[PDB]
PDB file of C-alpha atoms in Angstrom:
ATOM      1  CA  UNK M   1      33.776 -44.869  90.584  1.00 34.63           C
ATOM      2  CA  UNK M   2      30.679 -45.042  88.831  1.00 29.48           C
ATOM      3  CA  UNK M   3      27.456 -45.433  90.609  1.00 25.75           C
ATOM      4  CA  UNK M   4      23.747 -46.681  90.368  1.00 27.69           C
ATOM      5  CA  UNK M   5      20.758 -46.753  92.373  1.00 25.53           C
ATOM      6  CA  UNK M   6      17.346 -48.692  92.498  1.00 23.85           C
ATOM      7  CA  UNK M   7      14.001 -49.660  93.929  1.00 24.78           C
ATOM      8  CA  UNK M   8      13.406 -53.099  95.413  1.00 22.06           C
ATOM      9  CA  UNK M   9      10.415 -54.396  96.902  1.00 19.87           C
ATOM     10  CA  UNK M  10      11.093 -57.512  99.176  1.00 21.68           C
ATOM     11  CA  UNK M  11       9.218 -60.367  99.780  1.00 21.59           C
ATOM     12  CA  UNK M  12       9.406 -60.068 103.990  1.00 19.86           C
ATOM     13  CA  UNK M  13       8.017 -56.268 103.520  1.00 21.28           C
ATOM     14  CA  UNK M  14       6.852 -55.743 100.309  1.00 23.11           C
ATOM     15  CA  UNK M  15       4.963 -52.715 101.579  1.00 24.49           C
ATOM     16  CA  UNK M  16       7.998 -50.447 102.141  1.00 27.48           C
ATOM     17  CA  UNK M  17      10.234 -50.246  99.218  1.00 28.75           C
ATOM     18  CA  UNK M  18      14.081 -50.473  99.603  1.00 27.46           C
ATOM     19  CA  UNK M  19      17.027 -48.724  97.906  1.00 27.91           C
ATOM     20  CA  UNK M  20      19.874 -50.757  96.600  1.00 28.92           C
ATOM     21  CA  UNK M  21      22.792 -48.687  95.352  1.00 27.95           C
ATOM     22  CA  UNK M  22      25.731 -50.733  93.547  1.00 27.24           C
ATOM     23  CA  UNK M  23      29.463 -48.827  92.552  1.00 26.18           C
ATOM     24  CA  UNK M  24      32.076 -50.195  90.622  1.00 23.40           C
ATOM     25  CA  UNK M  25      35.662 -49.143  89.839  1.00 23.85           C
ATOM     26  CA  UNK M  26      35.885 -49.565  85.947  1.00 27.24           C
ATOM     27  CA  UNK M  27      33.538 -52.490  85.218  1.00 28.58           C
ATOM     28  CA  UNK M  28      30.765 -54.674  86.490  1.00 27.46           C
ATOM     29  CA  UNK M  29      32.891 -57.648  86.180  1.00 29.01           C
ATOM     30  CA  UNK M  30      35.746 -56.659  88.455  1.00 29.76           C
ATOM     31  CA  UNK M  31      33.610 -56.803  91.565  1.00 29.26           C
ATOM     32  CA  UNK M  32      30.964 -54.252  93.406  1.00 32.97           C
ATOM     33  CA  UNK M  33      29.869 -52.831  96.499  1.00 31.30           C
ATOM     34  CA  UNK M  34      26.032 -52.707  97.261  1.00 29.15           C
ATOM     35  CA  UNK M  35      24.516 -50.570  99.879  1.00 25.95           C
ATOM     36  CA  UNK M  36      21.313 -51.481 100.892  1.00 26.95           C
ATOM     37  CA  UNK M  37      18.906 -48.678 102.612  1.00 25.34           C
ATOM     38  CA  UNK M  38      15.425 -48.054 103.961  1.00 26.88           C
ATOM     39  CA  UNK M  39      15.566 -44.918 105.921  1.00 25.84           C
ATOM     40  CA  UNK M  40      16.489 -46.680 109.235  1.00 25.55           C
ATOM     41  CA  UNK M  41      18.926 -49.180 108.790  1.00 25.43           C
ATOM     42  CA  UNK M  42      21.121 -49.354 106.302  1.00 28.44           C
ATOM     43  CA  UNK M  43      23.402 -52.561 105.284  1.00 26.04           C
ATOM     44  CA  UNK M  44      26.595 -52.477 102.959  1.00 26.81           C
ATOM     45  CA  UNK M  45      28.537 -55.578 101.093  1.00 24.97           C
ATOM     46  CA  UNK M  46      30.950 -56.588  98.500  1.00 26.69           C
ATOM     47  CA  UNK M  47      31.132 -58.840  96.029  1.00 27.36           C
ATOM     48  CA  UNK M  48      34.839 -59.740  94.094  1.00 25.96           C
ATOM     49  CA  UNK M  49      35.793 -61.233  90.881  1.00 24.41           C
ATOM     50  CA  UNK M  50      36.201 -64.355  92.804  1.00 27.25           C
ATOM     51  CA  UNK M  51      32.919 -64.354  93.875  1.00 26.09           C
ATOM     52  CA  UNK M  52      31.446 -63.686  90.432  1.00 27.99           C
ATOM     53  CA  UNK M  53      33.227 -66.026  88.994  1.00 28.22           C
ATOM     54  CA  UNK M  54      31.606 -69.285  91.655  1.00 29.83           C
ATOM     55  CA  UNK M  55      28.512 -68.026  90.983  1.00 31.06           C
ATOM     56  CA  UNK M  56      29.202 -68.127  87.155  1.00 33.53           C
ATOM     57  CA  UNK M  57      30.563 -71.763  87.641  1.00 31.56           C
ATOM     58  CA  UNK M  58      28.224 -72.861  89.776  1.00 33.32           C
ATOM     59  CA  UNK M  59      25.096 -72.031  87.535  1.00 34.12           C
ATOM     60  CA  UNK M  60      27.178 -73.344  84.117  1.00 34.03           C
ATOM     61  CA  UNK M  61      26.781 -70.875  82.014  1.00 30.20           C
ATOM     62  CA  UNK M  62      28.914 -68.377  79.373  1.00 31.55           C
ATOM     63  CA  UNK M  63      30.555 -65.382  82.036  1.00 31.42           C
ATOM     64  CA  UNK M  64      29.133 -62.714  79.718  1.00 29.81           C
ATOM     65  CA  UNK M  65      25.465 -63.933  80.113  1.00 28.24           C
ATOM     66  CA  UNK M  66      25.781 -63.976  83.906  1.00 27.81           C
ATOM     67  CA  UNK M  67      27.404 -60.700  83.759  1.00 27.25           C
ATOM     68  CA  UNK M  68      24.354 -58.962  81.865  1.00 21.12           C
ATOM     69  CA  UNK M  69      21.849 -60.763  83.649  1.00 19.56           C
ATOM     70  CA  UNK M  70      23.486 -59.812  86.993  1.00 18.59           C
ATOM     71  CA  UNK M  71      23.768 -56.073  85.860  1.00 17.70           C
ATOM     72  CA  UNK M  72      20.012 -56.188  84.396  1.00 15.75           C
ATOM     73  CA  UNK M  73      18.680 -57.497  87.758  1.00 13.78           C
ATOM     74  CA  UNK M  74      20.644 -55.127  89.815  1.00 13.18           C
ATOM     75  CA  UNK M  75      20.556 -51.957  87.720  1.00 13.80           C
ATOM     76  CA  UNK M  76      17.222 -52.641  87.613  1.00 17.35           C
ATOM     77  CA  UNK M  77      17.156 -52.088  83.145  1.00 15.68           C
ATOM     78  CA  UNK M  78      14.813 -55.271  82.520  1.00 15.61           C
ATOM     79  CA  UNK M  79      12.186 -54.427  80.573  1.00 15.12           C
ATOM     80  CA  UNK M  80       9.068 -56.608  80.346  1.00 12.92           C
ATOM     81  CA  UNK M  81      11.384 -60.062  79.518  1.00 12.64           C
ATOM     82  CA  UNK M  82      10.743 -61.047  83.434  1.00 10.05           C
ATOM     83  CA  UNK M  83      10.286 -60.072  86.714  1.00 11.17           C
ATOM     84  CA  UNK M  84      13.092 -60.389  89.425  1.00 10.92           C
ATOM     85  CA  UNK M  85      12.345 -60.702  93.344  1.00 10.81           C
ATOM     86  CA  UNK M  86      14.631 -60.087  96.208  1.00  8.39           C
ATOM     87  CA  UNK M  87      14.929 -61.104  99.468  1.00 10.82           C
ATOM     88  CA  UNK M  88      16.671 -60.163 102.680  1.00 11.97           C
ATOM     89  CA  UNK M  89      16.581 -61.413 105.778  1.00 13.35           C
ATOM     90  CA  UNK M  90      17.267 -58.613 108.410  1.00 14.87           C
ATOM     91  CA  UNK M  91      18.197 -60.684 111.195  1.00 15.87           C
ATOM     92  CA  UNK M  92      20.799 -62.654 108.871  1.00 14.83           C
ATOM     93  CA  UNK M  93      22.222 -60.130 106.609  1.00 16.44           C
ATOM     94  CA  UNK M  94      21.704 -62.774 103.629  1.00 18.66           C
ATOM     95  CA  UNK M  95      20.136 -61.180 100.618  1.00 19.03           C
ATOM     96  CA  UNK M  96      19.235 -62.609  97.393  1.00 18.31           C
ATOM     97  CA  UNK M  97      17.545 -62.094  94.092  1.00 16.45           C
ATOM     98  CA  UNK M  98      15.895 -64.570  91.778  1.00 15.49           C
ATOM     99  CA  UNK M  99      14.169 -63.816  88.535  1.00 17.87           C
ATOM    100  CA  UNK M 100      10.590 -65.599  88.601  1.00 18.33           C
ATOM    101  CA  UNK M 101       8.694 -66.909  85.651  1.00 16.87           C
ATOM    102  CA  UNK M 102       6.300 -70.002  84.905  1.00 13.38           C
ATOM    103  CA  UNK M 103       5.873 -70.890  88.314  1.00 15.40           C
ATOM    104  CA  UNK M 104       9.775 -71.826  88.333  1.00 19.94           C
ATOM    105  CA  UNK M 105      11.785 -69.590  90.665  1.00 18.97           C
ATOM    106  CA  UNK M 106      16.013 -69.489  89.726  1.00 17.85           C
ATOM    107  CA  UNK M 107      18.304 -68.552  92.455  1.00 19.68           C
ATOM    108  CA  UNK M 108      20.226 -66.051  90.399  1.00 20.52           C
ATOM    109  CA  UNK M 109      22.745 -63.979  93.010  1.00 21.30           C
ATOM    110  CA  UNK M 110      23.427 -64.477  96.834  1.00 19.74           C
ATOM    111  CA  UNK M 111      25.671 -62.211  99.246  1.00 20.28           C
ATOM    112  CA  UNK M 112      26.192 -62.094 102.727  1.00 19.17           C
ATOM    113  CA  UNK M 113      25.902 -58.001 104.059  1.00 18.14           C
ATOM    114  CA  UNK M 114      26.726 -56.207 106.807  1.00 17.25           C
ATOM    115  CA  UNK M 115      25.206 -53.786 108.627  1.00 16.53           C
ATOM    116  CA  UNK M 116      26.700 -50.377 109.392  1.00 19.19           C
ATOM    117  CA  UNK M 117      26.840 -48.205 112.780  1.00 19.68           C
ATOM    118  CA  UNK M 118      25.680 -45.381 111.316  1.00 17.28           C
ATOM    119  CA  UNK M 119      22.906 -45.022 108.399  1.00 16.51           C
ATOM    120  CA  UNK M 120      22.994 -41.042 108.211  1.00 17.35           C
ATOM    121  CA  UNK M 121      26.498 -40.517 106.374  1.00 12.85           C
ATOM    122  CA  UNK M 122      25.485 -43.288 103.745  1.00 11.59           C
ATOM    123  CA  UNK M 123      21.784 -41.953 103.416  1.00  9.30           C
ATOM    124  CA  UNK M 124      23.525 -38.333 103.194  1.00 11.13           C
ATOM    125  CA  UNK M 125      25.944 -39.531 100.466  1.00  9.30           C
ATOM    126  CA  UNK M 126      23.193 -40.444  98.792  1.00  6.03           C
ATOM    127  CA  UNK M 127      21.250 -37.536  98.771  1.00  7.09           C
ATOM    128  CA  UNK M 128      24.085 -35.332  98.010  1.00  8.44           C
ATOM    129  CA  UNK M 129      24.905 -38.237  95.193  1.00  6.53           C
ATOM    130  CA  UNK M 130      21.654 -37.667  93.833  1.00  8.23           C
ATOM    131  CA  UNK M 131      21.360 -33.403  94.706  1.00 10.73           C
ATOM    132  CA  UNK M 132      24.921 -33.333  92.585  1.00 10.68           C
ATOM    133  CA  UNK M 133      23.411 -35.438  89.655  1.00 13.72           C
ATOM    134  CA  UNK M 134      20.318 -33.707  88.979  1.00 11.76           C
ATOM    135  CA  UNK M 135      22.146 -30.190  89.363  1.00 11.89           C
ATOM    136  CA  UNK M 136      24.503 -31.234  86.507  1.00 12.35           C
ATOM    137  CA  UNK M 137      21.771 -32.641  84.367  1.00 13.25           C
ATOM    138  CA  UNK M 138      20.110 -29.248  84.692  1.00 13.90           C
ATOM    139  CA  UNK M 139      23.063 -27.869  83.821  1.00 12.52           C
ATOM    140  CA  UNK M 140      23.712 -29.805  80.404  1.00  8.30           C
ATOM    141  CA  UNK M 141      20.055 -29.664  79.683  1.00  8.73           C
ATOM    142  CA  UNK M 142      19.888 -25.808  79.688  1.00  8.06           C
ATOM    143  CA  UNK M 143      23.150 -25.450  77.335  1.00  7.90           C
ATOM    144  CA  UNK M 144      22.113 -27.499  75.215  1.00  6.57           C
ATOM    145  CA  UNK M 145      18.703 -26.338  74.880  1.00  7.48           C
ATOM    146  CA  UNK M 146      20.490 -23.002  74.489  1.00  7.77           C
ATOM    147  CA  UNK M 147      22.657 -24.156  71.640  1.00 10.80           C
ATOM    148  CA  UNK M 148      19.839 -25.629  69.828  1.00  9.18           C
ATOM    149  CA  UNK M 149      17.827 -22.190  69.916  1.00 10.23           C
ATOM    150  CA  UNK M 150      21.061 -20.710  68.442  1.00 11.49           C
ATOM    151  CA  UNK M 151      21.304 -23.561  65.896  1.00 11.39           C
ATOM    152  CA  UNK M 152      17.563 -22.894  65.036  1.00  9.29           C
ATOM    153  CA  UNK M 153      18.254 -19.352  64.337  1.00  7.11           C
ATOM    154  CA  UNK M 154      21.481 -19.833  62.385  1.00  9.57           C
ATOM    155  CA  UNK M 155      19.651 -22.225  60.316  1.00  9.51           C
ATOM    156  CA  UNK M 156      16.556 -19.751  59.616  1.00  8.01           C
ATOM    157  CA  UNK M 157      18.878 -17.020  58.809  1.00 10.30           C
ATOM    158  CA  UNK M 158      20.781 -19.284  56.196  1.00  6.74           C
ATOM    159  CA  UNK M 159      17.235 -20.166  54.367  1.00  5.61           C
ATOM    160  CA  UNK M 160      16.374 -16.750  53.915  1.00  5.94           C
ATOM    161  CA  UNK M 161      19.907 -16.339  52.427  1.00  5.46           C
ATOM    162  CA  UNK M 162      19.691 -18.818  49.992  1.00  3.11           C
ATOM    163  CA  UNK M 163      15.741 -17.729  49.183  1.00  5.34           C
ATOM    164  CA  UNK M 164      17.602 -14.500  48.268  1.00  2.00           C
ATOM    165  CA  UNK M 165      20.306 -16.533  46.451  1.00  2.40           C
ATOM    166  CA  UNK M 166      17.947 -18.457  44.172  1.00  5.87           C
ATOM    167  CA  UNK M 167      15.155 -15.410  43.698  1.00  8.57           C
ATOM    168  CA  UNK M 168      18.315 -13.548  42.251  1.00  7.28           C
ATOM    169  CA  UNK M 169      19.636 -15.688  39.867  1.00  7.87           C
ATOM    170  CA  UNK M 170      17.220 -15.583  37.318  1.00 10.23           C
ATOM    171  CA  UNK M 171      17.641 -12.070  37.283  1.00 13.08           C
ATOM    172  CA  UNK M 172      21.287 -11.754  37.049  1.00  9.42           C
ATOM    173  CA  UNK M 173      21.344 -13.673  33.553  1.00  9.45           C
ATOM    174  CA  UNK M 174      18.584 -11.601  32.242  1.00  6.07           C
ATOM    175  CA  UNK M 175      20.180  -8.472  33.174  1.00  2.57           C
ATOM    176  CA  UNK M 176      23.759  -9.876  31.717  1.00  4.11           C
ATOM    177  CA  UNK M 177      21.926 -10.776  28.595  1.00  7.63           C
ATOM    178  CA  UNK M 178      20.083  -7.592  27.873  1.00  6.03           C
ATOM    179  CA  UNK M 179      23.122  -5.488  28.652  1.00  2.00           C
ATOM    180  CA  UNK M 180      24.731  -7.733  25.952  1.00  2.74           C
ATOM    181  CA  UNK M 181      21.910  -6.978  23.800  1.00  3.36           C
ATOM    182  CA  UNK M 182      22.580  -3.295  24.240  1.00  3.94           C
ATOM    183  CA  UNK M 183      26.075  -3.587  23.632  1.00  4.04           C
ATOM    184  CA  UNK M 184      26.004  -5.930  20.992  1.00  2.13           C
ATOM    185  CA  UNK M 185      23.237  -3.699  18.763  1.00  2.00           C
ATOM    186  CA  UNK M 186      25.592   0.029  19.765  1.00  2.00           C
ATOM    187  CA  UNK M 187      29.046  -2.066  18.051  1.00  2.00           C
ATOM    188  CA  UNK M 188      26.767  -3.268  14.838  1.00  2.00           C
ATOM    189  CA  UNK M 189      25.223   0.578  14.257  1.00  2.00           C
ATOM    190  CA  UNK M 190      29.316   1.070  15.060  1.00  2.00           C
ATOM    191  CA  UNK M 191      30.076  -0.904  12.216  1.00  2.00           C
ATOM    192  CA  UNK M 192      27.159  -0.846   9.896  1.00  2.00           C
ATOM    193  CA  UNK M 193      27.942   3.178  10.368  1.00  2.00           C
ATOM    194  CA  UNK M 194      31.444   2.484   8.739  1.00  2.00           C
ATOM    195  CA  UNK M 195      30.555   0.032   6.150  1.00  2.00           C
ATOM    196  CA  UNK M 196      28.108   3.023   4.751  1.00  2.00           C
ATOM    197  CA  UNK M 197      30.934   5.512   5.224  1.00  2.00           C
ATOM    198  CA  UNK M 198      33.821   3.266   3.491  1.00  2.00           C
ATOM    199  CA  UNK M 199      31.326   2.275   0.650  1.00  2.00           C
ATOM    200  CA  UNK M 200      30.501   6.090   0.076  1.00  2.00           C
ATOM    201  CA  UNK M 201      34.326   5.723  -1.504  1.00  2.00           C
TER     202      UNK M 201
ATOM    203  CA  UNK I   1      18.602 -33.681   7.459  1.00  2.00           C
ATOM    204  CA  UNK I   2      17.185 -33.144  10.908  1.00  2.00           C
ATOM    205  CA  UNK I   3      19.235 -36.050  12.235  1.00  2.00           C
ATOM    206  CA  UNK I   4      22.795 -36.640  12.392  1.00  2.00           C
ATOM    207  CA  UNK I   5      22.429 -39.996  11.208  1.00  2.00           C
ATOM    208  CA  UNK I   6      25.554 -41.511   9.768  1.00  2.00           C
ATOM    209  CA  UNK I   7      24.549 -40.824   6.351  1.00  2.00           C
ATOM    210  CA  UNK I   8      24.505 -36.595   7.507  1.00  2.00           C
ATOM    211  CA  UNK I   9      27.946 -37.436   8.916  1.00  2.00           C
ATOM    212  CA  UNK I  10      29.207 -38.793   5.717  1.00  2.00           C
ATOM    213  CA  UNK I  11      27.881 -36.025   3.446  1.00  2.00           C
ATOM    214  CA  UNK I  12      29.342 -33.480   5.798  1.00  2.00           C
ATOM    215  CA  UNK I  13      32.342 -34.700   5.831  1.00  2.00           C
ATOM    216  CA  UNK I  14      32.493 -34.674   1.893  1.00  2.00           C
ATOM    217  CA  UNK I  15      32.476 -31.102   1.932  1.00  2.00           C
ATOM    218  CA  UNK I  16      30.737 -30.258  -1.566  1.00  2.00           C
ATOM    219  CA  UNK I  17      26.887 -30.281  -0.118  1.00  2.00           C
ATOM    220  CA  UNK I  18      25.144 -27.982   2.498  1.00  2.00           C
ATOM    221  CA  UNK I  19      23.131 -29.221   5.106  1.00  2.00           C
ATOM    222  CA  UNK I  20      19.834 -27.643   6.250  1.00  2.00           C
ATOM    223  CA  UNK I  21      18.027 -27.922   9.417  1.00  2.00           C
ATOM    224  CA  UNK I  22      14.175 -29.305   8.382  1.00  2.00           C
ATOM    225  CA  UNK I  23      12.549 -26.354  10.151  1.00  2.00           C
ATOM    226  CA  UNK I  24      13.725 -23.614   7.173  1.00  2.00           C
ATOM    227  CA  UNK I  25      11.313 -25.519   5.230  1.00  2.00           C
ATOM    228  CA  UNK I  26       8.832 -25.494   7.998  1.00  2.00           C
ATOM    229  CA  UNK I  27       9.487 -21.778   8.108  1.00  2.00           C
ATOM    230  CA  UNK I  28       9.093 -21.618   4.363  1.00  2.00           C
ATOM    231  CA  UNK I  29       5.446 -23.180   4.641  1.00  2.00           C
ATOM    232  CA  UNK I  30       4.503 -20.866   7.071  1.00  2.00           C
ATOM    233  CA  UNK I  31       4.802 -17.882   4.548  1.00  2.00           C
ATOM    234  CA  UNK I  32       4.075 -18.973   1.780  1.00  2.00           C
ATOM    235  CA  UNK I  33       7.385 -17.782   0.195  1.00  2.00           C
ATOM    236  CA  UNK I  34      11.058 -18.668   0.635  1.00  2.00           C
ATOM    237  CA  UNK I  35      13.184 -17.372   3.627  1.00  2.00           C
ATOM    238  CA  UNK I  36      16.803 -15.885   2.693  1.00  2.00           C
ATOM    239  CA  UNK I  37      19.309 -18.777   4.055  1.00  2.00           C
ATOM    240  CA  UNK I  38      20.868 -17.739   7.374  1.00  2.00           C
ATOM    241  CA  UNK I  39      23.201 -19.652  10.179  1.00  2.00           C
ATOM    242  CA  UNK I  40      20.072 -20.549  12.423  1.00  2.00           C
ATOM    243  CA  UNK I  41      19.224 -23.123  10.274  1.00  2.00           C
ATOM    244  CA  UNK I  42      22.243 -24.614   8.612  1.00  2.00           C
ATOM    245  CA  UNK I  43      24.592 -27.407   9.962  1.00  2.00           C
ATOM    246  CA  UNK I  44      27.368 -27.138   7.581  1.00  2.00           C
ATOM    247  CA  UNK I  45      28.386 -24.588   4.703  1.00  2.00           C
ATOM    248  CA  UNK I  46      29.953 -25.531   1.403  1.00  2.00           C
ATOM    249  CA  UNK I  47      32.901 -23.944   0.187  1.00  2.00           C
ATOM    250  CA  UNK I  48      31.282 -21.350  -1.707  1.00  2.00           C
ATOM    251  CA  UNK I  49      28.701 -20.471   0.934  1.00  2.00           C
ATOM    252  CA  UNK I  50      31.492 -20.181   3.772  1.00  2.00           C
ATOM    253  CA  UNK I  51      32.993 -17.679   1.322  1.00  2.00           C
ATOM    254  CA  UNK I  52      29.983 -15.841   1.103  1.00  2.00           C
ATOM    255  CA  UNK I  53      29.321 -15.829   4.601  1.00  2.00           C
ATOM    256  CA  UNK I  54      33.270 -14.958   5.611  1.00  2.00           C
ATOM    257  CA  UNK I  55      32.593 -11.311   5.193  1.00  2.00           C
ATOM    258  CA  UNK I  56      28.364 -11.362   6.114  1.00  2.00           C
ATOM    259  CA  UNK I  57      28.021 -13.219   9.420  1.00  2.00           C
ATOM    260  CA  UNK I  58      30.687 -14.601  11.989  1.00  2.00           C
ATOM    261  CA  UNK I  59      31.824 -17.737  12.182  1.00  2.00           C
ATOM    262  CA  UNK I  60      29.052 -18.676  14.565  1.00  2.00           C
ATOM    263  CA  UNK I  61      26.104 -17.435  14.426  1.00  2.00           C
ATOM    264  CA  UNK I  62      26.059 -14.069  15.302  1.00  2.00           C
ATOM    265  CA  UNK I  63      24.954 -10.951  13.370  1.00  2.00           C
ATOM    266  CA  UNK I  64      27.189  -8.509  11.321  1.00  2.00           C
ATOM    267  CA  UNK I  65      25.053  -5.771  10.363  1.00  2.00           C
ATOM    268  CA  UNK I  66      21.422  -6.433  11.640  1.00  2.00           C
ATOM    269  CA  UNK I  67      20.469  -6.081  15.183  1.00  2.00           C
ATOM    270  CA  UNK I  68      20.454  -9.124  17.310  1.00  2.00           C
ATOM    271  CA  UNK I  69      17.111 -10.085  19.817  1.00  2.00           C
ATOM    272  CA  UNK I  70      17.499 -12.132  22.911  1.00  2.00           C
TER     273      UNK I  70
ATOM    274  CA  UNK B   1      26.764 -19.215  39.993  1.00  2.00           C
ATOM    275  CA  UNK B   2      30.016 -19.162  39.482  1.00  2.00           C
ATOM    276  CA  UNK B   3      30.331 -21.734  36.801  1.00  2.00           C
ATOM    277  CA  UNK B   4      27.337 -20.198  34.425  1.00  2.00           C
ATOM    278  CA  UNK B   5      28.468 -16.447  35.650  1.00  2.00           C
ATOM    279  CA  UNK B   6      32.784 -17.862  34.235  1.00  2.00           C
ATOM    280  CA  UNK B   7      31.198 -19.556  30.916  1.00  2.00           C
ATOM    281  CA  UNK B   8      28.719 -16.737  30.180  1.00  2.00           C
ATOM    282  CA  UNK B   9      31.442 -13.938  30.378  1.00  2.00           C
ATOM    283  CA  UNK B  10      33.972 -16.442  28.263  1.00  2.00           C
ATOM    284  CA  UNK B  11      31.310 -16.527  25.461  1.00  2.00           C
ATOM    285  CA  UNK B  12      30.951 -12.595  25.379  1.00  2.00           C
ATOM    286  CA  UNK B  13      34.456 -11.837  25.671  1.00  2.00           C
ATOM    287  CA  UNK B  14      34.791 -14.175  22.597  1.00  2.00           C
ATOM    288  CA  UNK B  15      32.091 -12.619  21.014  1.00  2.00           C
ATOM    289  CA  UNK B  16      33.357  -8.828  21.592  1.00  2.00           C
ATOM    290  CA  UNK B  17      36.713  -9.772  20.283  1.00  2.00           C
ATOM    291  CA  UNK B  18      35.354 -11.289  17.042  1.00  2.00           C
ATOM    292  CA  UNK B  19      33.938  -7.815  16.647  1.00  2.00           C
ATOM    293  CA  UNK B  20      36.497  -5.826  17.443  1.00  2.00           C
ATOM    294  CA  UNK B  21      38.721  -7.798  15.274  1.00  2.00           C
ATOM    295  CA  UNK B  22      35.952  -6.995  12.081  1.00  2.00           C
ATOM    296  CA  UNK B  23      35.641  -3.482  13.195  1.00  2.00           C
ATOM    297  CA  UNK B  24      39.391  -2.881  13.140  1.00  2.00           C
ATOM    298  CA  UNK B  25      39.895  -4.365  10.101  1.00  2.00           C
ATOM    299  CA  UNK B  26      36.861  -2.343   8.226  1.00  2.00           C
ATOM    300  CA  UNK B  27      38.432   0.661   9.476  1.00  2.00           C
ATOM    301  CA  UNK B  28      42.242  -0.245   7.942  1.00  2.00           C
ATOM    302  CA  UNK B  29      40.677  -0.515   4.339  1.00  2.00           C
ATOM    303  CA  UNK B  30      39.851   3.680   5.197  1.00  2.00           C
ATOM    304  CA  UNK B  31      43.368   4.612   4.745  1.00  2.00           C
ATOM    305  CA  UNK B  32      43.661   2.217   1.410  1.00  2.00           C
ATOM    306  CA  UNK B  33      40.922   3.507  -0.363  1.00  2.00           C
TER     307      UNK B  33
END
């Protein structure tokens, strides 16, 4: 059950903005339920794979085109490709949304809503949708921010350590090497000490 | 012979003739007299100077009775 | 570190040896002569 919600402005009222919020099961494709709300009525629909598939038909075109364009309208992800306007009659329960460019307006989805009894449980599930959402995202945003501050100190600590590493390097060979001088010149006065002595013979 | 040129590699390989690095002679020049043969500068020893140098340095170049400097 | 710290102690423990090897056999010729 996975969840979105948007801002529409219709034509009738383009003053006061709407919510549209669409759910699906596993995927887009399978079918949706749309819930539309404005804080005093509130109107609910559903749209099946049977459905989709009509309104792919009908328009002639590839099924995974209409699905993107269907979830780019809806979700509301366009970017500045084109503009999409929506209309519902209240008095009909007949909404639909075009996408408008050129002076040429496409009739791109139609459904047939209906309204509910009540709008305060489906405004409330919203809310508490929403309330739930940005809770969690606080949530993951804080840990993480938390594990990055550790990350930043691990990774400060482990440049000092390796400054340390490389500043004592050099100065491990050139204490091995003059300890191997010392050594080196004690074993030749060693045997230079003995070639005198056996020579003395 | 500075270079091991194929020419150095065939005279070494004939083991009767020692080879010495060019910069003994630079060394020479520098003094103004001649500089006592040592392992620095060679690249191969004849017979006779291997024999010499059995018993005076190691078989590399390390020092038998003078002190040794980094 | 490793690497130079393995070759550097290979070439003095060959190096030591040689000498030990030379100071041992100075000090046989003692008894001899």
């Amino acid at each position: 059950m996975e969840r979105k919600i948007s801002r529409i402005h219709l034509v009738s009222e383009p003053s006061i903005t709407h919510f549209l919020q669409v759910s699906w099961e596993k995927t887009l494709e399978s079918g949706f339920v749309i819930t539309l709300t404005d804080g005093h009525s509130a109107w609910t629909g559903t749209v099946s794979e049977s459905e989709i598939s009509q309104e792919a038909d009908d328009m002639a075109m590839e099924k995974g085109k209409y699905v993107g364009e269907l979830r780019k309208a809806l979700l509301s992800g366009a970017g500045p490709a084109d503009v999409y306007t929506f209309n519902f009659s209240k008095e009909s329960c007949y909404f639909f949304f075009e996408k408008n460019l050129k002076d040429v307006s496409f009739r791109l989805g139609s459904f047939n809503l209906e309204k509910v009894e009540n709008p305060a449980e489906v405004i409330r599930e919203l809310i508490c949708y929403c309330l739930d959402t940005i809770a969690e995202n606080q949530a993951k945003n804080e840990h993480l921010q938390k594990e990055n501050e550790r990350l930043l100190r691990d990774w400060n600590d482990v440049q000092g350590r390796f400054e340390k590493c490389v500043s004592a390097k050099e100065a491990l060979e050139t204490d091995l090497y003059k300890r191997f001088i010392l050594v080196l010149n004690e074993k030749k006065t060693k045997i230079r000490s003995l070639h005198n002595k056996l020579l003395n013979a | 012979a500075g270079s091991e040129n194929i020419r150095v590699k065939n005279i070494i390989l004939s083991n009767k003739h020692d080879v010495v690095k060019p910069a003994w002679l630079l060394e020479c020049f520098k003094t103004k007299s001649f500089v006592p043969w040592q392992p620095r500068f060679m690249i191969h020893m004849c017979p006779s100077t291997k024999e010499h140098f059995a018993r005076e340095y190691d078989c590399y170049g390390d020092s038998y009775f003078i002190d040794t400097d980094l």
